[PDB]
mmCIF file of C-alpha atoms in Angstrom:
data_model
loop_
_atom_site.group_PDB
_atom_site.id
_atom_site.type_symbol
_atom_site.label_atom_id
_atom_site.label_comp_id
_atom_site.label_asym_id
_atom_site.label_seq_id
_atom_site.Cartn_x
_atom_site.Cartn_y
_atom_site.Cartn_z
ATOM 1 C CA UNK A 114 -60.982 -61.021 -4.604
ATOM 2 C CA UNK A 115 -58.589 -63.847 -4.085
ATOM 3 C CA UNK A 116 -55.335 -63.702 -6.521
ATOM 4 C CA UNK A 117 -54.453 -60.101 -6.807
ATOM 5 C CA UNK A 118 -54.953 -59.503 -2.920
ATOM 6 C CA UNK A 119 -52.862 -62.223 -2.318
ATOM 7 C CA UNK A 120 -50.091 -61.286 -4.726
ATOM 8 C CA UNK A 121 -50.212 -57.656 -3.325
ATOM 9 C CA UNK A 122 -49.270 -59.409 0.382
ATOM 10 C CA UNK A 123 -46.701 -61.250 -1.256
ATOM 11 C CA UNK A 124 -45.200 -57.962 -2.496
ATOM 12 C CA UNK A 125 -45.699 -55.948 0.424
ATOM 13 C CA UNK A 126 -42.496 -56.672 2.668
ATOM 14 C CA UNK A 127 -39.812 -56.565 -0.299
ATOM 15 C CA UNK A 128 -41.245 -52.899 -1.119
ATOM 16 C CA UNK A 129 -41.159 -51.860 2.238
ATOM 17 C CA UNK A 130 -37.610 -52.980 2.781
ATOM 18 C CA UNK A 131 -36.552 -51.157 -0.427
ATOM 19 C CA UNK A 132 -37.821 -47.908 0.231
ATOM 20 C CA UNK A 133 -36.608 -48.549 3.880
ATOM 21 C CA UNK A 134 -33.201 -48.555 2.180
ATOM 22 C CA UNK A 135 -33.849 -45.574 -0.176
ATOM 23 C CA UNK A 136 -35.091 -43.543 2.987
ATOM 24 C CA UNK A 137 -31.678 -44.486 4.447
ATOM 25 C CA UNK A 138 -29.879 -43.582 1.333
ATOM 26 C CA UNK A 139 -31.298 -40.031 1.237
ATOM 27 C CA UNK A 140 -30.445 -39.339 4.494
ATOM 28 C CA UNK A 141 -26.895 -40.672 4.115
ATOM 29 C CA UNK A 142 -26.437 -38.415 0.886
ATOM 30 C CA UNK A 143 -27.540 -35.664 2.893
ATOM 31 C CA UNK A 144 -25.231 -36.238 5.561
ATOM 32 C CA UNK A 145 -22.499 -36.689 3.044
ATOM 33 C CA UNK A 146 -22.845 -33.217 1.420
ATOM 34 C CA UNK A 147 -22.188 -31.347 4.911
ATOM 35 C CA UNK A 148 -18.632 -29.618 4.751
ATOM 36 C CA UNK A 149 -17.506 -26.950 7.271
ATOM 37 C CA UNK A 150 -16.298 -23.878 5.167
ATOM 38 C CA UNK A 151 -13.575 -22.180 7.126
ATOM 39 C CA UNK A 152 -13.266 -18.532 6.118
ATOM 40 C CA UNK A 153 -10.122 -16.649 5.543
ATOM 41 C CA UNK A 154 -9.763 -13.163 6.674
ATOM 42 C CA UNK A 155 -7.451 -10.340 6.140
ATOM 43 C CA UNK A 156 -4.758 -10.452 8.417
ATOM 44 C CA UNK A 157 -4.652 -7.473 10.511
ATOM 45 C CA UNK A 158 -0.549 -7.032 10.683
ATOM 46 C CA UNK A 159 -1.055 -5.649 7.220
ATOM 47 C CA UNK A 160 -3.343 -3.244 8.271
ATOM 48 C CA UNK A 161 -1.021 -2.305 11.252
ATOM 49 C CA UNK A 162 1.470 -2.226 8.580
ATOM 50 C CA UNK A 163 -0.172 0.207 6.292
ATOM 51 C CA UNK A 164 -1.554 2.067 9.427
ATOM 52 C CA UNK A 165 2.352 2.551 10.228
ATOM 53 C CA UNK A 166 3.206 3.671 6.743
ATOM 54 C CA UNK A 167 0.627 6.334 6.513
ATOM 55 C CA UNK A 168 2.356 7.808 9.388
ATOM 56 C CA UNK A 169 5.583 8.582 7.211
ATOM 57 C CA UNK A 170 7.325 6.709 9.851
ATOM 58 C CA UNK B 210 -7.963 40.729 -12.589
ATOM 59 C CA UNK B 211 -5.258 37.930 -12.608
ATOM 60 C CA UNK B 212 -4.980 35.438 -10.372
ATOM 61 C CA UNK B 213 -2.234 33.582 -8.384
ATOM 62 C CA UNK B 214 -3.105 30.495 -6.724
ATOM 63 C CA UNK B 215 -1.669 29.716 -3.074
ATOM 64 C CA UNK B 216 -1.284 26.350 -2.158
ATOM 65 C CA UNK B 217 -0.550 25.471 1.635
ATOM 66 C CA UNK B 218 1.203 21.950 2.479
ATOM 67 C CA UNK B 219 2.617 21.578 5.783
ATOM 68 C CA UNK B 220 3.736 25.531 5.649
ATOM 69 C CA UNK B 221 3.809 27.912 9.080
ATOM 70 C CA UNK B 222 1.292 30.280 8.782
ATOM 71 C CA UNK B 223 4.288 33.063 8.932
ATOM 72 C CA UNK B 224 5.797 31.844 5.689
ATOM 73 C CA UNK B 225 2.242 32.258 4.163
ATOM 74 C CA UNK B 226 1.614 35.516 5.513
ATOM 75 C CA UNK B 227 5.310 36.869 4.397
ATOM 76 C CA UNK B 228 4.431 35.515 0.617
ATOM 77 C CA UNK B 229 0.739 37.477 0.829
ATOM 78 C CA UNK B 230 2.859 40.424 1.827
ATOM 79 C CA UNK B 231 5.265 40.106 -0.883
ATOM 80 C CA UNK B 232 2.821 39.699 -3.741
ATOM 81 C CA UNK B 233 0.424 42.401 -2.291
ATOM 82 C CA UNK B 234 3.465 44.838 -1.948
ATOM 83 C CA UNK B 235 5.237 44.162 -5.292
ATOM 84 C CA UNK B 236 1.967 43.417 -7.612
ATOM 85 C CA UNK B 237 0.209 46.647 -6.177
ATOM 86 C CA UNK B 238 -3.307 45.108 -6.556
ATOM 87 C CA UNK B 239 -3.386 44.551 -10.278
ATOM 88 C CA UNK B 240 -3.192 40.546 -9.875
ATOM 89 C CA UNK B 241 -5.629 39.087 -7.093
ATOM 90 C CA UNK B 242 -4.020 36.420 -5.112
ATOM 91 C CA UNK B 243 -6.303 33.555 -3.654
ATOM 92 C CA UNK B 244 -5.780 30.453 -1.624
ATOM 93 C CA UNK B 245 -6.588 27.015 -2.641
ATOM 94 C CA UNK B 246 -5.211 23.264 -2.465
ATOM 95 C CA UNK B 247 -4.933 22.348 -5.997
ATOM 96 C CA UNK B 248 -4.373 24.295 -9.178
ATOM 97 C CA UNK B 249 -2.492 23.786 -12.724
ATOM 98 C CA UNK B 250 -1.219 26.849 -13.693
ATOM 99 C CA UNK B 251 -0.160 30.309 -12.142
ATOM 100 C CA UNK B 252 0.414 28.489 -8.779
ATOM 101 C CA UNK B 253 3.004 28.847 -5.613
ATOM 102 C CA UNK B 254 2.771 26.035 -3.189
ATOM 103 C CA UNK B 255 4.519 26.377 0.108
ATOM 104 C CA UNK B 256 5.546 24.078 2.418
ATOM 105 C CA UNK B 257 7.571 20.695 2.429
ATOM 106 C CA UNK B 258 4.597 18.493 1.674
ATOM 107 C CA UNK B 259 3.892 17.513 -1.786
ATOM 108 C CA UNK B 260 0.535 19.090 -3.244
ATOM 109 C CA UNK B 261 -2.242 17.215 -4.755
ATOM 110 C CA UNK B 262 -2.174 17.052 -8.532
ATOM 111 C CA UNK B 263 1.570 17.143 -9.381
ATOM 112 C CA UNK B 264 3.644 14.222 -10.696
ATOM 113 C CA UNK B 265 7.031 15.637 -11.358
ATOM 114 C CA UNK B 266 9.379 17.510 -8.901
ATOM 115 C CA UNK B 267 12.083 19.020 -10.992
ATOM 116 C CA UNK B 268 14.632 21.167 -9.156
ATOM 117 C CA UNK B 269 17.953 22.665 -10.622
ATOM 118 C CA UNK B 270 20.352 25.320 -9.911
ATOM 119 C CA UNK B 271 19.635 28.906 -11.155
ATOM 120 C CA UNK B 272 22.624 30.896 -12.440
ATOM 121 C CA UNK B 273 21.497 34.039 -10.374
ATOM 122 C CA UNK B 274 21.016 32.688 -6.864
ATOM 123 C CA UNK B 275 23.798 30.342 -6.783
ATOM 124 C CA UNK B 276 25.781 30.163 -3.517
ATOM 125 C CA UNK B 277 29.481 31.170 -3.595
ATOM 126 C CA UNK B 278 30.063 27.890 -2.448
ATOM 127 C CA UNK B 279 28.201 26.189 -5.055
ATOM 128 C CA UNK B 280 29.196 28.589 -7.986
ATOM 129 C CA UNK B 281 29.225 26.742 -11.347
ATOM 130 C CA UNK B 282 27.699 23.323 -10.149
ATOM 131 C CA UNK B 283 24.928 22.401 -12.764
ATOM 132 C CA UNK B 284 22.750 19.322 -11.869
ATOM 133 C CA UNK B 285 19.068 18.835 -12.548
ATOM 134 C CA UNK B 286 17.471 16.758 -9.672
ATOM 135 C CA UNK B 287 13.977 15.270 -10.723
ATOM 136 C CA UNK B 288 11.929 13.755 -8.306
ATOM 137 C CA UNK B 289 8.609 11.292 -9.710
ATOM 138 C CA UNK B 290 5.807 12.235 -7.808
ATOM 139 C CA UNK B 291 2.803 9.409 -7.982
ATOM 140 C CA UNK B 292 -0.819 10.848 -7.630
ATOM 141 C CA UNK B 293 -1.454 11.965 -4.448
ATOM 142 C CA UNK B 294 -5.150 10.940 -2.543
ATOM 143 C CA UNK B 295 -6.600 12.186 0.369
ATOM 144 C CA UNK B 296 -4.522 12.270 3.814
ATOM 145 C CA UNK B 297 -6.908 9.358 5.200
ATOM 146 C CA UNK B 298 -6.586 7.276 2.235
ATOM 147 C CA UNK B 299 -3.668 5.060 1.566
ATOM 148 C CA UNK B 300 -1.152 6.343 -0.497
ATOM 149 C CA UNK B 301 -0.403 4.690 -3.760
ATOM 150 C CA UNK B 302 3.548 4.867 -2.686
ATOM 151 C CA UNK B 303 2.634 2.438 0.177
ATOM 152 C CA UNK B 304 -0.500 0.679 -1.403
ATOM 153 C CA UNK B 305 1.746 -0.556 -4.215
ATOM 154 C CA UNK B 306 3.971 -2.178 -1.790
ATOM 155 C CA UNK B 307 1.421 -3.397 1.184
ATOM 156 C CA UNK B 308 -1.007 -4.645 -0.950
ATOM 157 C CA UNK B 309 1.066 -7.266 -2.894
ATOM 158 C CA UNK B 310 2.215 -8.494 0.610
ATOM 159 C CA UNK B 311 -1.540 -8.712 1.781
ATOM 160 C CA UNK B 312 -2.250 -10.628 -1.885
ATOM 161 C CA UNK B 313 -4.853 -8.010 -2.955
ATOM 162 C CA UNK B 314 -4.896 -7.245 -6.631
ATOM 163 C CA UNK B 315 -2.654 -4.453 -7.601
ATOM 164 C CA UNK B 316 -3.290 -4.210 -11.177
ATOM 165 C CA UNK B 317 -5.002 -0.176 -11.541
ATOM 166 C CA UNK B 318 -2.342 0.896 -8.616
ATOM 167 C CA UNK B 319 0.450 -0.685 -10.988
ATOM 168 C CA UNK B 320 -1.198 1.208 -14.434
ATOM 169 C CA UNK B 321 -1.181 4.445 -12.194
ATOM 170 C CA UNK B 322 2.263 4.251 -10.955
ATOM 171 C CA UNK B 323 3.452 3.128 -14.673
ATOM 172 C CA UNK B 324 1.925 6.289 -16.202
ATOM 173 C CA UNK B 325 3.577 8.702 -13.579
ATOM 174 C CA UNK B 326 6.714 6.993 -13.759
ATOM 175 C CA UNK B 327 6.718 7.033 -17.565
ATOM 176 C CA UNK B 328 5.771 11.041 -17.493
ATOM 177 C CA UNK B 329 8.349 11.409 -14.919
ATOM 178 C CA UNK B 330 11.202 9.576 -16.909
ATOM 179 C CA UNK B 331 10.347 11.611 -20.215
ATOM 180 C CA UNK B 332 10.781 14.932 -18.179
ATOM 181 C CA UNK B 333 14.086 13.683 -16.910
ATOM 182 C CA UNK B 334 15.337 12.423 -20.360
ATOM 183 C CA UNK B 335 14.221 15.782 -21.950
ATOM 184 C CA UNK B 336 16.108 17.476 -19.255
ATOM 185 C CA UNK B 337 19.324 15.211 -20.077
ATOM 186 C CA UNK B 338 18.915 15.901 -23.652
ATOM 187 C CA UNK B 339 18.833 19.853 -23.437
ATOM 188 C CA UNK B 340 21.701 19.502 -21.286
ATOM 189 C CA UNK B 341 23.725 17.473 -23.058
ATOM 190 C CA UNK B 342 24.488 14.668 -20.768
ATOM 191 C CA UNK B 343 24.851 10.841 -21.498
ATOM 192 C CA UNK B 344 23.872 8.920 -18.696
ATOM 193 C CA UNK B 345 21.473 9.664 -15.726
ATOM 194 C CA UNK B 346 21.943 8.442 -12.370
ATOM 195 C CA UNK B 347 18.455 6.604 -10.883
ATOM 196 C CA UNK B 348 18.108 6.873 -6.751
ATOM 197 C CA UNK B 349 16.139 4.456 -5.201
ATOM 198 C CA UNK B 350 15.989 3.464 -1.293
ATOM 199 C CA UNK B 351 17.620 -0.159 -1.055
ATOM 200 C CA UNK B 352 15.271 -0.634 2.153
ATOM 201 C CA UNK B 353 13.479 -4.088 2.361
ATOM 202 C CA UNK B 354 10.064 -2.475 2.601
ATOM 203 C CA UNK B 355 10.520 -0.590 -0.553
ATOM 204 C CA UNK B 356 11.171 -3.870 -2.581
ATOM 205 C CA UNK B 357 8.159 -3.238 -5.140
ATOM 206 C CA UNK B 358 7.589 0.265 -5.866
ATOM 207 C CA UNK B 359 11.524 0.780 -6.488
ATOM 208 C CA UNK B 360 11.545 -2.425 -8.642
ATOM 209 C CA UNK B 361 8.965 -1.379 -10.739
ATOM 210 C CA UNK B 362 10.264 2.330 -10.577
ATOM 211 C CA UNK B 363 13.673 1.061 -12.110
ATOM 212 C CA UNK B 364 11.937 -1.508 -14.386
ATOM 213 C CA UNK B 365 10.193 1.522 -16.337
ATOM 214 C CA UNK B 366 12.614 4.260 -16.167
ATOM 215 C CA UNK B 367 15.207 2.223 -17.353
ATOM 216 C CA UNK B 368 13.053 0.970 -19.947
ATOM 217 C CA UNK B 369 11.784 4.507 -21.207
ATOM 218 C CA UNK B 370 15.665 6.061 -20.936
ATOM 219 C CA UNK B 371 17.093 3.348 -23.110
ATOM 220 C CA UNK B 372 14.159 3.314 -25.493
ATOM 221 C CA UNK B 373 15.340 7.142 -25.711
ATOM 222 C CA UNK B 374 19.044 5.988 -26.097
ATOM 223 C CA UNK B 375 20.697 7.263 -22.591
ATOM 224 C CA UNK B 376 22.427 5.255 -19.951
ATOM 225 C CA UNK B 377 21.065 4.867 -16.490
ATOM 226 C CA UNK B 378 23.062 4.198 -13.223
ATOM 227 C CA UNK B 379 21.017 2.993 -10.278
ATOM 228 C CA UNK B 380 22.062 4.074 -6.541
ATOM 229 C CA UNK B 381 20.751 4.116 -3.083
ATOM 230 C CA UNK B 382 19.785 7.168 -1.061
ATOM 231 C CA UNK B 383 22.578 7.793 1.213
ATOM 232 C CA UNK B 384 25.453 7.635 -1.051
ATOM 233 C CA UNK B 385 23.780 9.955 -3.714
ATOM 234 C CA UNK B 386 22.719 12.476 -1.076
ATOM 235 C CA UNK B 387 26.332 12.337 0.228
ATOM 236 C CA UNK B 388 27.570 13.145 -2.999
ATOM 237 C CA UNK B 389 25.135 15.952 -4.155
ATOM 238 C CA UNK B 390 26.074 17.774 -0.952
ATOM 239 C CA UNK B 391 29.557 17.046 -1.068
ATOM 240 C CA UNK B 392 30.727 16.806 -5.012
ATOM 241 C CA UNK B 393 27.724 17.384 -7.155
ATOM 242 C CA UNK B 394 29.546 18.591 -10.101
ATOM 243 C CA UNK B 395 29.859 14.812 -11.082
ATOM 244 C CA UNK B 396 26.150 14.305 -11.362
ATOM 245 C CA UNK B 397 24.240 15.798 -14.205
ATOM 246 C CA UNK B 398 20.774 14.807 -14.099
ATOM 247 C CA UNK B 399 19.436 12.616 -11.105
ATOM 248 C CA UNK B 400 15.851 11.051 -11.048
ATOM 249 C CA UNK B 401 14.350 10.125 -7.615
ATOM 250 C CA UNK B 402 11.883 7.302 -6.664
ATOM 251 C CA UNK B 403 9.033 8.474 -4.683
ATOM 252 C CA UNK B 404 9.631 7.934 -1.242
ATOM 253 C CA UNK B 405 9.861 10.345 1.720
ATOM 254 C CA UNK B 406 13.705 10.105 2.063
ATOM 255 C CA UNK B 407 14.021 11.211 -1.686
ATOM 256 C CA UNK B 408 11.812 14.188 -0.683
ATOM 257 C CA UNK B 409 13.855 15.019 2.114
ATOM 258 C CA UNK B 410 17.317 14.578 -0.080
ATOM 259 C CA UNK B 411 15.246 16.982 -2.706
ATOM 260 C CA UNK B 412 14.495 19.620 -0.048
ATOM 261 C CA UNK B 413 17.984 19.514 1.490
ATOM 262 C CA UNK B 414 19.802 20.238 -1.887
ATOM 263 C CA UNK B 415 16.920 22.976 -2.609
ATOM 264 C CA UNK B 416 18.238 24.350 0.393
ATOM 265 C CA UNK B 417 22.009 23.889 0.715
ATOM 266 C CA UNK B 418 22.360 25.262 -2.987
ATOM 267 C CA UNK B 419 21.436 29.034 -1.413
ATOM 268 C CA UNK B 420 17.451 28.266 -1.266
ATOM 269 C CA UNK B 421 15.968 28.010 -4.852
ATOM 270 C CA UNK B 422 12.364 27.001 -6.336
ATOM 271 C CA UNK B 423 11.151 23.833 -7.105
ATOM 272 C CA UNK B 424 8.869 23.374 -10.455
ATOM 273 C CA UNK B 425 6.316 21.278 -10.350
ATOM 274 C CA UNK B 426 4.768 19.667 -13.609
ATOM 275 C CA UNK B 427 0.927 18.549 -12.873
ATOM 276 C CA UNK B 428 -1.156 16.118 -14.863
ATOM 277 C CA UNK B 429 -2.912 19.056 -16.548
ATOM 278 C CA UNK B 430 -0.139 20.270 -18.041
ATOM 279 C CA UNK B 431 2.244 23.032 -16.996
ATOM 280 C CA UNK B 432 4.797 24.387 -14.268
ATOM 281 C CA UNK B 433 3.795 25.472 -10.762
ATOM 282 C CA UNK B 434 6.491 26.941 -8.294
ATOM 283 C CA UNK B 435 7.388 25.621 -5.008
ATOM 284 C CA UNK B 436 8.922 26.910 -2.054
ATOM 285 C CA UNK B 437 9.396 26.217 1.654
ATOM 286 C CA UNK B 438 11.507 29.010 3.054
ATOM 287 C CA UNK B 439 11.483 32.810 2.790
ATOM 288 C CA UNK B 440 14.098 33.164 0.502
ATOM 289 C CA UNK B 441 12.303 29.735 -1.514
ATOM 290 C CA UNK B 442 8.993 31.044 -1.495
ATOM 291 C CA UNK B 443 10.294 34.659 -2.585
ATOM 292 C CA UNK B 444 12.065 33.465 -5.229
ATOM 293 C CA UNK B 445 9.030 31.074 -6.447
ATOM 294 C CA UNK B 446 6.773 34.168 -6.571
ATOM 295 C CA UNK B 447 9.436 35.955 -8.585
ATOM 296 C CA UNK B 448 9.127 33.044 -11.082
ATOM 297 C CA UNK B 449 5.637 33.331 -11.169
ATOM 298 C CA UNK B 450 5.213 36.655 -11.577
ATOM 299 C CA UNK B 451 7.991 36.399 -14.598
ATOM 300 C CA UNK B 452 5.918 33.772 -16.030
ATOM 301 C CA UNK B 453 2.445 36.480 -15.814
ATOM 302 C CA UNK B 454 4.602 38.584 -17.689
ATOM 303 C CA UNK B 455 6.375 41.099 -15.178
ATOM 304 C CA UNK B 456 10.073 41.541 -15.533
ATOM 305 C CA UNK B 457 10.983 44.521 -13.475
ATOM 306 C CA UNK B 458 8.905 43.345 -10.415
ATOM 307 C CA UNK B 459 10.506 40.094 -10.666
ATOM 308 C CA UNK B 460 14.087 41.181 -10.892
ATOM 309 C CA UNK B 461 13.268 43.534 -7.813
ATOM 310 C CA UNK B 462 11.919 40.376 -5.550
ATOM 311 C CA UNK B 463 15.117 38.382 -6.839
ATOM 312 C CA UNK B 464 17.398 41.069 -5.490
ATOM 313 C CA UNK B 465 15.549 41.524 -2.265
ATOM 314 C CA UNK B 466 15.795 37.736 -1.595
ATOM 315 C CA UNK B 467 19.361 37.714 -2.262
ATOM 316 C CA UNK B 468 19.995 40.256 -0.063
ATOM 317 C CA UNK B 469 18.036 39.907 2.773
ATOM 318 C CA UNK B 470 16.547 36.502 2.920
ATOM 319 C CA UNK B 471 14.374 36.396 5.981
ATOM 320 C CA UNK B 472 12.742 39.794 5.704
ATOM 321 C CA UNK B 473 12.463 40.111 1.879
ATOM 322 C CA UNK B 474 9.207 42.177 2.703
ATOM 323 C CA UNK B 475 10.482 44.903 4.472
ATOM 324 C CA UNK B 476 13.716 44.978 2.372
ATOM 325 C CA UNK B 477 12.146 45.378 -1.030
#
């Protein structure tokens, strides 16, 4: 009725702070893993060159 | 009963009709004449274009049909022919040089080109050994575009020829063409890498000599005759009939071709 309640009350703030920090850490890790992938596609000039070769030019 | 297979590759309908009339009038109907797009034996191909299924493009100077201008000449021109795909698809001779620039992998194409060049080089060295020459002349177009197909062609042809024990002399296209048309007695065996210019050079030599029939060695193993003009097609048909086992008819066709080039069908 008295002792364990008081010590739980004492515990509450530090646990709240640590869990807030943990959530911020999770969000930070989520953000840090984001990279824009630029893709590379076959240049059309080689297609234009193969087209010309096929013509026997 | 028998069958002659006519392949059409860029030939005007007049030439094909003339060939059909010649075979019908000479053979007399004993051997049928069917038309197709690919064959391995008993086949005549008409037109400058290269048919599908041929790997070597040998041509010689037959003694009987020697023009008076080129009397006594003896030089064998062998053109290496890479496998031919459909007209729409990219040909190997161009893929092997464009894919490398584009960065695409070129392993299977290199393997196929290597096999074709090995077969062509084997044919060329066989011809050279039969004729007795010691050195053969490789012909490669020196354009910057063809900086990979010709490199592989040299690397393989010289390798095979040296393995056989003969010498190779590399040269460009213009110089060899001029030498072949002007002073051909100084060349015994000339191999040609697979390019359009080399095809034109082979046709020019086959025509200037007086009109001859070019032999094509196919993948299946065999020889098929090739012509592009009236006299050349007549000679090709004569050789084909000889192969089928007809001597008198072949001689008659050859004589008619010698006498009246453009109107052999009426001449005989």
